[PDB]
Design a protein around this ligand. Structure first.
Ligand SMILES: Nc1ncnc2c1ncn2[C@@H]1O[C@H](COP(=O)(O)OP(=O)(O)OP(=O)(O)O)[C@@H](O)[C@H]1O
Ligand SMILES: [Mg+2]
Lengths: 193, 141, 281, 121, 105, 52, 172, 29, 52, 52, 70
């Protein structure tokens, strides 16, 4: 009908369930609620064996699975979105699609907030001036008002500088790489001149 | 049949039994080969054992080759036929000699199973059908 | 001046999902182009062939045994390019333009795409000036002009490479008696041949002196099937340099019947439906 | 290191939870009637390699420990192999004891390069 | 000698003939022998018959590359090398090419 | 061959009675090497091959 | 979806527990009220996932060897040919009409054995060794595997003695 | 780690999106 | 619940002509796969099938 | 929203040439599968394609 | 089921009984072969279905034998 536009487009049959779940939850403005219920369901399948038996065992009938998922999800602040979603995934035997629908829901939510998770690998631990002059250098690697979520790391094999890891792209602004590409260029010149 | 065993997996039997009957007969004849006596084994229509193994492989969704035979259809006949050996003096001196039987289709020995077993074995006894009605019986070309 | 102009660019990453049969599935590379040359972390290049919704299908220009699942694929930013120019004369290069003669890198050269749309109707003109091959059976009976495509078809060991070789050597002989504007710079593309025959052929071309005008592109029998597939296109780009700048070029794609076998291998390993004689459509 | 996933005839899929072996690498199977050696053919994705076996895969259980060797099939080379019978994995078949090895070399190798060819027939 | 998919009887006959003619010596005079047999018989899986020619190449590549010799490599029935690689290609699910061989023939 | 043998092995003379069986076999394009007639050659005592 | 963002869900990430503690008291009676509509879960047994044309796909059977005789609950023998990640495809030594979806499969621990020995001389067996001539079971007989390896290069001598066929054409 | 059983989704149908959209669009109030 | 055996006959209710199915294999999701002794033109999905 | 018709032509924005696609199928998830009138070397998987 | 396709079509050409009106239906199916190869799939299917065959040859067609009935 009239659903909100998804923040970023995705692949098929496990991410389309997440895009539909996101558009329904943004139509109800329960975006942080059903993400929390999805995390609670990940932990639920982590905790008990009888619950993941309804997702892995092929000999449980559909009637048992849909009636257990209906009867155990009657109340307790679970939204109509999550309860109808688990009815819809239990009706089809597709309860195994939860672990792959939550990561696409997470990517959808991490795109509606205009954020970006990153990893800064520095040779030494950072100060409160060695960090503040880094993020203004790191914010030119996003193309909009994306606020990076700083993640610091340590690696002594860098000789100072920083490496950014955006999980999509990697900027090697280190010195140990700079003295590597210095020697390659100076050796590729002396073999010419 | 004081000296003959018969392993009979007929056409009514399931295809794994028809596939497995040469290996059963060879494991029976390896008693005589491996204990110093002498064996002689005839696999009548090894071209039906290959058909039974093709049926089992195509129903197990194995990738087919030419004539829909699996990849290990040469290995099937070779790991059976190489058990027909003449053992040395330290292993008792026993022997097992095999006579596989392959039915060709109008003499076309360029078919797949016929080329496989021709490459495996130590010679052929050809039995052409033009020599058969000419009076020459056995019709040995 | 290298120090003041040094920015490490934002390298777009990609994991290898699954490799094998000379084609890798590459997660990521969200901005890669179709047909773009990508670079694996082992140094072996690759062409982004099938951009799919979730992965990228990369044919691997070389041996796929050096690639593992979880290796990083870096995109180079441009379509599959070979170095073309006057620095390629004299050089024995592989299917991607990297020199295998061991005489150092190709200097005085310029990168250009291997897959260029051929010139149209209005770009041609009639084939008017002759190209002498030095084989008087050919030059008397089957005369060949400049701008022609002439199939040397025959059996195994019937003298096809010899007609090609005599044409290349005769170009060296005529190039010392003609002005600059009409000089034929030859390319030999050896696809699917033995490396020993390409070595003896390079010896022949340098001991007669014809290697001064010859480029030799060799994707031999041990080279990967995408390299044998791509080597005619690399050679045709290197000769299109001389075609496009007013000069004249000769090219021998020796055994395109082995390029078609390399392409049949590539297509049948991509699960593409075979056609007549199991070749793709 | 890795454990057997599928055994479909001579083709064995092995699952490695950590680091995958390379293609053409050798894999020994721990606990078997004979020395079963697998050779990696491709990486199927999902941390699973697909191997082709050098012996019979009869008697193979899903979950059998498969160890990475880190190299292709390495066979004994040298003058000590003269007059000896080796199989594909370099084992003595003539039952005359071990094979005196100057070195062990991987059977997979690139062709000699263009500078290494000789140009004289 | 790389016997690729040899019959085991003919492999044993070649081995005994090499002992008799003197090109293979047994016992303490083994070092004066002139050949190395590499045997993958017919009774082996296609993965084993596809790499016996590579094992024969490795033993000969040692004598070429280290000892600096002129080596002979008898790949017995190269067609059986072809058909063993055809079998390992069909077992790996690759689509066969023309007449039935592997697409990477 | 398994379906044809499962049908065909029931048409037998046993120690109770007898079934004399006459079964016409269509041979496609007169090709006796076709597998559907070539499978049912071993299932018969007397084959009466009619030729074109 | 990718693996780098899915392997970080092994860590807990909820920061609220209003459903984990709610259904944990509610899961077990909701499971138990359809306990007779359950089937007992198999690990080292096997349950027939599907069957047809003499092939049974078998869920479970965690420790079958490749080529091992498995037995169904109808007594029909099978042979585990291709072990897969999620099932075992076994081949049925007989009619699969007595094998239904949901039948129990029991491994026997034996690769396919046959009766060999002096007592099998003069007998008519089927392809598995069991007698079909109807004159009792095979006595004076020990079992042996059918997939033994052939003798090697060194375990043979040259073929020298003649075996007489009695036919003049082949013997000449 | 028992969450590794739920790693790959086992879809018994292709048009599952239509079934879950028949059940999630009526979850909107 | 309670799949029919293989080779068993099934009778489709609601069909105009008497349509008899014969079970050929168990597909695995409580589904049998059948071949029809008469024409299947007119079969509706969900139409009741009574095992014999 | 508002998928193009089959046989309708589409224009890829930002190419080296005028890459005109032509819709051949409706794949099913608001995806139309097109045949390109020119070479697709240089296409990126986000490229805006207008519908004529 | 391409045999069943032509089989259920060509079996409706029937000579009905006197109880059902005595009407008739005569089918004349036309199969084109490729270079005389009647050993094709559809050609052998319809040859096995139909009663007669009016086989027309190209070599008799250009000998002036027209209609070229072999
Ligand atoms: N004009 C000629 N006069 C005499 N001998 C020739 C001539 N041309 C070729 N030959 C001989 O014929 C042999 C084959 O020639 P060439 O190498 O051209 O064959 P080819 O076409 O390359 O075959 P292949 O591609 O199979 O190697 C060569 O060894 C050469 O010695
Ligand atoms: Mg040539």
């Amino acid at each position: 009908l009239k659903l909100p536009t998804a923040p970023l487009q995705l692949s098929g049959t496990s991410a389309q369930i997440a895009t539909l779940l996101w558009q329904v939850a943004a139509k109800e403005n329960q975006l942080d609620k059903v993400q929390d219920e999805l995390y609670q369901f990940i932990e639920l399948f982590k905790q008990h064996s009888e619950l993941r038996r309804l997702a892995t065992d092929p000999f449980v009938p559909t009637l048992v699975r849909t009636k257990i998922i209906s009867s155990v999800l009657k109340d307790s602040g679970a939204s109509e979105i999550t309860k109808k979603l688990f009815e819809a995934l239990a009706d089809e035997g597709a309860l195994s699609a939860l672990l792959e629908v939550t990561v696409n829901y997470e990517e959808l939510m991490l795109a509606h907030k205009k954020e970006v998770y990153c990893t800064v690998i520095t040779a030494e631990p950072l100060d409160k001036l060695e960090r503040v002059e880094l993020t203004k250098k790191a914010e030119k690697f996003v193309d909009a008002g994306f606020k990076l979520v700083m993640q610091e790391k340590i690696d002594k094999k860098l000789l100072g500088g920083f490496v950014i890891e955006f999980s999509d792209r990697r900027v090697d602004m280190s010195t140990a790489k700079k003295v590597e590409e210095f020697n390659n260029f100076v050796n590729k010149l002396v073999l010419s001149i | 049949m004081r000296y003959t065993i018969m392993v009979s997996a007929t056409a009514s039997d399931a295809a794994p039994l028809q596939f497995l009957a040469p290996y059963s007969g060879c494991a029976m004849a390896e008693y005589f080969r491996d204990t110093g006596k002498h064996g002689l084994i005839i696999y009548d229509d090894l071209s039906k054992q290959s058909v039974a193994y093709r049926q089992m492989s195509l129903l197990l969704r194995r990738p087919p080759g030419r004539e829909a035979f699996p990849g290990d259809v040469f290995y099937l006949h070779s790991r059976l036929l190489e058990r027909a050996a003449k053992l040395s003096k330290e292993l008792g001196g026993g022997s097992l000699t095999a006579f596989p039987v392959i039915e060709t289709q109008a003499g076309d020995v360029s078919a797949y199973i016929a080329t496989n077993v021709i490459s495996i074995t130590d010679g052929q006894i050809f039995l052409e059908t033009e020599l058969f009605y000419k009076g020459i019986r056995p019709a040995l070309n | 001046e290298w120090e003041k102009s040094y920015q490490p660019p934002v390298i777009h990453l990609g994991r290898v999902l699954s490799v094998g049969d000379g084609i890798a599935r590459v997660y990521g590379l969200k901005s890669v182009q179709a047909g773009e040359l990508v670079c694996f972390d082992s140094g072996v290049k690759g062409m982004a062939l099938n951009l799919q919704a979730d992965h990228v299908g990369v044919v691997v220009f070389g041996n796929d045994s050096v690639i593992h699942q979880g290796d990083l694929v870096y995109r180079t930013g441009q379509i599959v390019n070979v170095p073309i120019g006057p620095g390629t004369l004299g050089r024995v290069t592989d299917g991607l333009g990297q020199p295998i003669d061991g005489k150092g890198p190709l200097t005085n050269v310029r990168s250009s795409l291997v897959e260029v749309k051929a010139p149209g109707i209005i770009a041609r003109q009639s084939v008017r000036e002759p190209l002498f091959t030095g084989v008087k059976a050919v030059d008397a009976l089957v005369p060949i002009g400049r701008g022609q495509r002439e199939l040397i078809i025959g059996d195994r060991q019937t003298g096809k490479t010899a007609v090609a070789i005599d044409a290349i050597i005769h170009q060296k002989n005529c190039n010392e008696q003609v002005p600059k504007a009409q000089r034929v710079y030859c390319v030999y593309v050896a696809v699917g041949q033995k490396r020993s025959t390409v070595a003896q052929l390079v010896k022949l071309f340098t001991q007669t002196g014809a290697m001064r005008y010859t480029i030799m592109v060799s994707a031999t029998a041990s080279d990967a099937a995408p390299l044998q597939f791509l080597a005619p296109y690399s050679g045709c780009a290197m000769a299109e340099y001389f075609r496009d700048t007013g000069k004249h070029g000769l090219i021998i794609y020796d055994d395109l019947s082995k390029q078609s076998v390399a392409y049949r291998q590539m297509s049948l390993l991509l699960r593409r439906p075979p056609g007549r004689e199991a070749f793709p459509g | 290191a890795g454990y057997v996933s599928q055994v479909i005839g001579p083709v064995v899929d092995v699952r490695f939870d950590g680091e995958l072996p390379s293609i053409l690498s050798s894999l020994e199977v721990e606990g078997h009637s004979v020395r079963l050696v697998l050779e990696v053919a491709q990486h199927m994705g999902d941390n699973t390699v697909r191997c082709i076996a050098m012996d019979s895969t009869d008697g193979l259980v899903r979950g059998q420990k498969v160890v990475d060797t880190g190299s292709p099939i390495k066979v004994p080379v040298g003058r000590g192999t003269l007059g000896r019978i080796m199989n594909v994995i370099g084992e003595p078949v003539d039952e005359q004891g071990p094979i005196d090895a100057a070195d062990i070399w991987s059977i997979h190798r690139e062709a000699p390069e263009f500078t290494e060819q000789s140009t004289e027939q | 000698f790389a016997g690729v998919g040899e019959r085991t009887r003919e492999g044993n006959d070649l081995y005994r003939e090499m002992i008799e003619s003197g090109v293979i010596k047994l016992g303490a005079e083994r070092g004066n022998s002139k050949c190395t047999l590499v045997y993958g018989q017919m009774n082996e899986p296609p993965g084993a018959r596809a790499r016996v020619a590579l094992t024969g190449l490795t033993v000969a590549e040692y004598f070429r590359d280290i000892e600096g010799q002129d080596v002979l490599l008898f790949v017995d029935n190269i067609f059986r090398f072809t058909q063993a690689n055809s079998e390992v290609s069909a077992l790996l699910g690759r689509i066969p090419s023309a007449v039935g061989y592997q697409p990477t023939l | 061959a398994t379906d044809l043998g499962g049908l065909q092995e029931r048409i037998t003379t046993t120690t109770k009675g007898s079934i004399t069986s006459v079964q016409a076999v269509y041979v496609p394009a007169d090709d006796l090497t076709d597998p559907a007639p070539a499978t049912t050659f071993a299932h018969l005592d007397a084959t009466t091959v009619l030729s074109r | 979806a990718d693996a780098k963002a899915l392997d970080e869900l092994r860590k807990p990430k909820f920061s609220s527990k209003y459903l984990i503690q709610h259904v944990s008291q509610k899961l077990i009676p909701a499971v138990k009220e359809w306990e007779k509509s359950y089937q007992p879960p198999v690990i080292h047994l096997g349950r027939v996932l599907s069957v047809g044309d003499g092939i049974a796909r078998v869920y479970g059977l965690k420790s079958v060897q490749a080529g091992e005789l498995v037995c169904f609950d109808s007594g029909v023998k099978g042979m585990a040919l291709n072990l897969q990640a999620d099932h075992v495809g076994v081949v049925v030594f007989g009619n699969d009409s007595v094998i239904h979806q949901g039948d129990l499969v029991y491994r026997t621990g034996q690769i396919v054995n046959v009766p060999i020995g002096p007592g099998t001389l003069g007998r008519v067996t089927d392809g598995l060794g069991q007698p079909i001539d109807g004159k009792g079971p095979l006595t004076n007989v020990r079992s042996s595997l059918v997939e033994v390896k052939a003798p090697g290069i060194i375990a043979r001598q040259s073929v020298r003695e003649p075996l007489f066929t009695g036919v003049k054409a082949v013997d000449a």
